[PDB]
């Protein structure tokens, strides 16, 4: 089909290397010093690699169209395009074979396992320190024997010939060549047949697997030692000249030049028959040079240049963050991109953004050229460029027409979540400052403090249409992580609405009656009435019921003038009740959610734009201002401070007598200071919040109109703690240790602080600033690990059809419910039907929960329900739509082709940065790290007792010892106190030692469900305390990847207890399940692994290699000759192929439907 659907990695034989090489390099010459041209047999030599110029020989004698494929007799250079040089490869002959550095230093080294001997002894033989007998002979000395030089001489004298003890790489290669796999494997298995792997046998397991893999591959074992090395093409290692008359040279070129000269010197020494010691030194130096070239510093200090920086090995380039796999493969810097400053752009629409004219012209310059050619203004590309250079007036109109309906992508430097990248329609604007909508800013998490954004333009028709369909700002309203809308007003827009909504007990025009909103607006324009004044308005409009029935609402309702003005903005089908309130920021978000759920996204977007317009206009009219007088110090603060000082003096008097201990006095002083500070803070709130005025008929307290209180009450900006500090006191200040300083600050920001008090306060701020910068890297690393673990997960089928799920109940903390069961179960389908205590079934199985449906469970008071989950999902390497249930971002069942794993990984990672104490505990839970001295669990159920030597090896009679007499106990430390009675009926998997729960024990003993419940409770408990909101399903999806490995108790056709993939076991069980009869296909027990351990264990070598540990993964894959189908989103991106998710799956399904109609 002309397409390669598979990629395989295998060891390369010497014959294969010779076939790859187009030429052989004998002398290390790069370029002639006088003239910058290729050397005759140099690494840059033109004859082997190719011609520098296209269809031009190096001599230049053959320079015409008449000869294209001809080869000049004068020079080896062929006539062809210069591009051939990059793909052209060369080989260097080696006088003495060199062992590969990667296999020898594999850690575990493959050569050491194959020879079944210590790595140190092999290194000693390689260095020539020792002699190994290649041929056993009739002599007693074993073939695997290291002989000292005096011992070797004595053996030669006693036995003379009949035995061989060569040293260096040649001896190791000969030993590898003279090995019989069939003889060794059968004897090794026979040792396996007598299985004693408590200690000695465990090591032997690896050798059998390695031998079997080698036999299956058919690759020669001796191939690991290389008799010849290929040379990388010159273009990959350029020596191109630069300004200042200097040439940049790659590190690889220097290593290649050194190796070639060393090989030439070795050959000359062999030709001269020079002394053996000098030959040995030359052989060792050549081996060291080869090791340095493949990877310098692996076993020795790295060689360095005149600069002294360590040289870069070929292995170094492919690995590391600067490595080729993650640096250029995923960096992919792209053209048609712009970075500019961001402006508030308030007049702009929610879907419209402001773009500078110059940037738009540069980005669409090719499109402008095409339009000009179509117009006929310019008949040539050069003419169009010249007209564009002069910025002709007609060009601007053409640019406006071209960009009228063209989408653009805006991105930020930290893309924590998919919401960060969005698509807007650009409108030409003056100035170089980019303008974006204020509401979209919250999703971007950026502010106008000099922040910079990058704009990308989609060229393809599918990409531009696709970005508009799913990447548009209007499309994203609710957060992917949570249902709550992200488009709600954040700062001033909320404050103006809150100010207008407030009512005044006495105002001009109070008690007036207005028939319609227009009449109230005319009255406000006159200004005789007061906005805070109370009026009665008759309102008649349709209302939408939860069932969706529409009913007419009519009558006279008392409302504030501001609420009546806001009435016009509200759309039809929405009750006036939501507007009839203080309209606090929490209320505005609830109103937006209600509009989106019933009215729909478009109506909600229109309502948000109207609210944003109204808030800006009203806030300016309010003209709220912040002043020093606005903040008010408490009148009784001085008396409280004096009382606290008197209490501290009394404590000091007690300590001086020696009556009280120093530690108790310090604790008492800290408590007294904290109580005084809290009382001072409580007093300040009442005075600022409460204002007393002499209204007609007497003086009464009314809510304060102070700007600071309104801002704090509004919740748009600020908080109670900041108000307490400004009008209150700093009080206790934490030192770097965090222990509160005994002295406390009674000073406040408005009154200022003493120099000593400011110095005491300085440490805490500095410590916090240091903590904020360091934490940024950890959150990103954790998010990357989560993405790697859940990267391939996706939804491929509507229904798995499994009836197995999990039990859901309210997570009471013992002091409060904390989470309602309905909220926890909301958006989740039910695995089984629910039967009421009355015995009448309420909900059928496989029914998705809905807010209307959720009411019944509370009404029926059912505290426990069973719901389907990803862990329970039976699909192989896929998630059914039903198990995920509600997407939770579009308020609909998740559509097929959506990548749940990527979203789940990103949603947990983004919230982590805000939370501080905290991230490490979550990381430990994800890694499945086991706590030290966590506890002990006993599998057998039996009476618990002690009395077995009392030596820290105390054991108990787990066997009953009555029906059958047996002992089932293991040694445990007597250091910790026992948690069991002298006589009791011990149960299987019951805790015997108090301490932290162990994650591994629960899966094998308590089962998967108990472990899943514990993990969910811990993760939700940690996230909720900080107030962050995360859906339970997102946590569970990561857990499903955590358990893909099981131990096979019975190997009917498979291996033994060695870990195997669940997907492999199920398919193998299926193949033997009905292939002949039953065949005892398999018996397995699930196991728990760390997220990094799971990611490295992935079947695809390329995905594992890219994440990290590339050299080790490559070395393991090459011996196995693993053949890998990409089977992944990451594999496709490296090959630049469409991923098997989202649009790509849909295109394939549509193509499959198209084939049938022709068929």
């Amino acid at each position: 089909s002309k397409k390669f659907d598979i990629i395989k990695i295998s060891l390369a034989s010497p014959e294969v290397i010779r076939s790859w090489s187009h030429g052989e390099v004998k002398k290390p010459e790069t370029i002639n010093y006088r003239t910058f041209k290729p050397e005759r047999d140099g690494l840059f030599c033109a004859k082997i690699f190719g011609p520098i110029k296209d269809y031009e020989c190096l001599c230049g004698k053959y320079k015409r169209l008449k000869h294209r494929g001809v080869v000049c007799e004068r020079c080896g250079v062929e006539v062809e395009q210069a591009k051939v040089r990059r793909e052209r490869m060369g080989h260097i002959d080696l006088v003495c074979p060199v062992v590969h550095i990667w296999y020898l230093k594999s850690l575990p080294s493959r050569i050491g396992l194959f020879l079944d001997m210590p790595l140190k002894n092999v290194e000693k033989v390689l260095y020539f320190e020792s002699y190994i007998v290649t041929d056993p002979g009739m002599t007693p000395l074993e073939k695997k024997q290291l002989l000292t030089d005096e011992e070797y001489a004595e053996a030669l004298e006693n036995y003379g010939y009949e035995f061989e003890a060569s040293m260096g790489a040649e001896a190791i290669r000969d030993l590898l060549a003279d090995t019989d796999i069939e003889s060794e494997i059968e004897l090794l298995q026979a040792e396996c047949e007598e299985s004693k792997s408590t200690a000695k046998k465990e090591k032997a397991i690896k050798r059998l697997r390695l031998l079997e893999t080698f036999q299956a591959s058919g690759n020669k074992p001796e191939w690991m030692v290389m008799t010849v090395l290929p040379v990388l093409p010159p273009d990959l290692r350029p020596l191109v000249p630069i300004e200042g008359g200097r040439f940049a040279t790659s590190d690889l070129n220097d290593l290649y030049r050194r190796v070639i000269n060393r090989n030439n010197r070795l050959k000359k020494l062999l030709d001269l028959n020079a002394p053996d010691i000098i030959v040995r030194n030359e052989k060792r130096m050549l081996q060291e040079a080869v090791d340095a070239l493949l990877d310098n510093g692996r076993r020795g200090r790295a060689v360095t240049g005149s600069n002294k920086r360590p040289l870069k090995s070929l292995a170094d380039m492919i690995k590391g963050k600067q490595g080729r796999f993650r640096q250029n493969l995923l960096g992919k810097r792209v053209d048609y991109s712009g970075r500019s400053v961001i402006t508030v752009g308030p007049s702009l629409r929610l879907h419209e953004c402001g773009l500078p004219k110059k940037m738009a012209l540069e980005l669409f310059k090719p499109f402008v050229y095409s339009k000009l050619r179509l117009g006929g203004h310019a008949t040539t590309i050069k003419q169009a460029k010249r007209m564009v250079e002069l910025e002709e007036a007609v060009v601007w109109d053409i640019l406006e027409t071209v960009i009228n309906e063209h989408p653009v992508l805006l991105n930020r430097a930290p893309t924590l979540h998919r919401l960060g990248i969005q698509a807007f329609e650009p409108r030409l604007i003056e100035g170089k400052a980019i303008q974006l909508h204020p509401l979209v800013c919250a999703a971007f998490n950026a502010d106008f403090d000099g922040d910079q954004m990058a704009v990308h333009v989609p060229l393809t028709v599918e990409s531009q249409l696709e970005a508009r369909v799913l990447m548009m700002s209007t499309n994203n309203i609710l957060s992917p992580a949570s249902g709550q809308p992200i488009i709600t007003p954040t700062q001033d827009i909320v404050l103006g609405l809150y100010y207008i909504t407030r009512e005044k007990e006495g105002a001009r025009g109070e008690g007036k009656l207005f028939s319609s909103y227009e009449d109230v607006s005319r009255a406000y324009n006159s200004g005789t009435i007061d906005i805070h004044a109370k009026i009665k308005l008759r309102i008649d409009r349709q209302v939408f019921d939860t069932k969706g029935n529409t009913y007419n609402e009519k009558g006279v309702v008392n409302t504030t003038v501001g609420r009546a003005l806001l009435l016009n903005i509200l759309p039809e089908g929405l009750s006036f009740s939501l507007l009839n309130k203080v309209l606090v920021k929490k209320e505005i978000s609830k109103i937006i959610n209600q509009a989106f759920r019933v009215l729909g996204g478009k109506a909600t977007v229109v309502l948000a734009d109207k609210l944003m317009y109204a808030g800006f206009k009203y806030s300016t009219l309010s003209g709220v201002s912040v002043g020093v007088d606005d903040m008010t110090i408490p009148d009784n603060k001085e008396a409280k401070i004096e009382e606290a000082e008197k209490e501290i003096k009394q404590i000091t008097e007690q300590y001086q007598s020696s009556l009280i201990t120093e530690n108790e006095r310090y604790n008492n002083i800290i408590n007294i200071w904290s109580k005084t500070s809290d009382e001072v803070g409580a007093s300040m709130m009442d005075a600022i919040s409460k204002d007393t005025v002499s209204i007609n008929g007497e003086k009464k307290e009314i809510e304060s109109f102070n700007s600071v209180y309104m801002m704090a009450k509004s919740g748009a900006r600020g908080s109670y703690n900041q108000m307490r500090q400004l009008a209150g006191m700093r009080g206790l200040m934490a030192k770097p240790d965090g222990t509160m300083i005994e002295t406390a600050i009674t000073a406040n920001f408005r009154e200022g602080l003493s120099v000593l008090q400011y110095f005491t306060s300085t440490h805490g701020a500095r410590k916090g600033l240091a903590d904020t910068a360091l934490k940024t890297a950890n959150a990103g690393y954790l998010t990357r690990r989560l993405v790697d673990v859940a990267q391939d997960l996706v939804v491929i089928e509507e229904d798995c059809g499994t009836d197995d799920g999990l039990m859901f109940s309210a997570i009471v903390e013992d002091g409060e419910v904390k989470v309602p069961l309905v909220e926890r179960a909301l958006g989740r389908t039910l695995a089984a039907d629910v039967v009421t205590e009355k015995g009448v079934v309420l909900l059928e199985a496989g029914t998705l929960l809905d807010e209307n449906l959720v009411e019944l469970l509370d009404d029926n008071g059912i505290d426990m329900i069973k719901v389907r989950s990803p862990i329970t999902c039976k699909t192989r390497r896929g998630l059914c739509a039903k198990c995920y249930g509600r997407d939770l971002a579009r308020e609909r069942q998740v559509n097929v082709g959506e990548s749940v794993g990527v979203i789940a990984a990103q949603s947990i990672g983004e919230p982590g940065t805000q939370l501080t104490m905290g991230l490490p505990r979550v990381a430990e839970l994800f890694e499945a790290r086991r706590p030290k001295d966590a506890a002990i669990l006993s599998p057998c159920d039996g009476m618990v007792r002690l009395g077995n030597r009392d030596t820290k090896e105390k054991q108990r009679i787990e066997i009953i010892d009555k029906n059958g007499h047996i002992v089932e106990e293991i040694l445990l430390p007597k250091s910790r106190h026992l948690v069991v009675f002298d006589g009791e009926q011990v149960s299987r998997g019951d805790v015997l030692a108090d301490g932290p729960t162990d994650p591994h024990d629960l899966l094998k003993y308590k089962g998967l469900e108990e472990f899943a419940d514990y993990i969910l409770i811990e993760a939700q408990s940690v996230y909720r305390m900080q107030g962050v909101v995360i859906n339970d399903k997102h946590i569970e999806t990561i857990v499903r990847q955590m358990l893909r490995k099981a131990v096979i108790l019975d190997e009917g056709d498979s291996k033994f207890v060695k870990d195997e993939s669940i997907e492999l076991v199920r398919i193998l069980e299926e193949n033997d399940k009905l292939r002949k009869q039953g065949k005892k296909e398999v018996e397995y027990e699930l196991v728990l692994m760390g997220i990094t351990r799971s990611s490295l264990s992935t079947e695809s070598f390329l995905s594992a290699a890219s994440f990290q540990e590339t050299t080790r993964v490559l070395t393991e894959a090459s011996i196995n000759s693993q053949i890998d189908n990409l089977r992944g989103l990451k594999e496709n991106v490296l090959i630049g192929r469409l991923i098997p998710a989202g649009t790509g799956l849909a295109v394939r399904k549509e193509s499959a439907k198209i084939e049938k109609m022709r068929e």
Partner: protein
């Protein structure tokens, strides 16, 4: 666009995008760009979405169009 109107006829939000792309490619290959109508009217890709919103084109009919070409 809001794509919300297009979604009533089409399902999943992915099949609709693929159908719109195929329709836009067919219209561009139809020679529709005489250059006298492109300036006065919106781009073809939006036109395909408008046709889907009207529902006149019919998603099933679009699949039949691929065989013709």
């Amino acid at each position: 666009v809001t794509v919300e109107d297009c979604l009533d006829k089409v399902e999943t939000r992915f099949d609709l995008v693929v159908l719109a792309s195929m329709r836009a490619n067919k219209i561009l290959k139809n020679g529709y760009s005489e250059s006298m109508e492109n300036e006065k009217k919106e781009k073809a890709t939006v036109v395909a979405l408008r046709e889907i919103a009207e529902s006149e084109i019919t998603s099933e009919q679009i699949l039949r169009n691929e065989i013709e070409g």
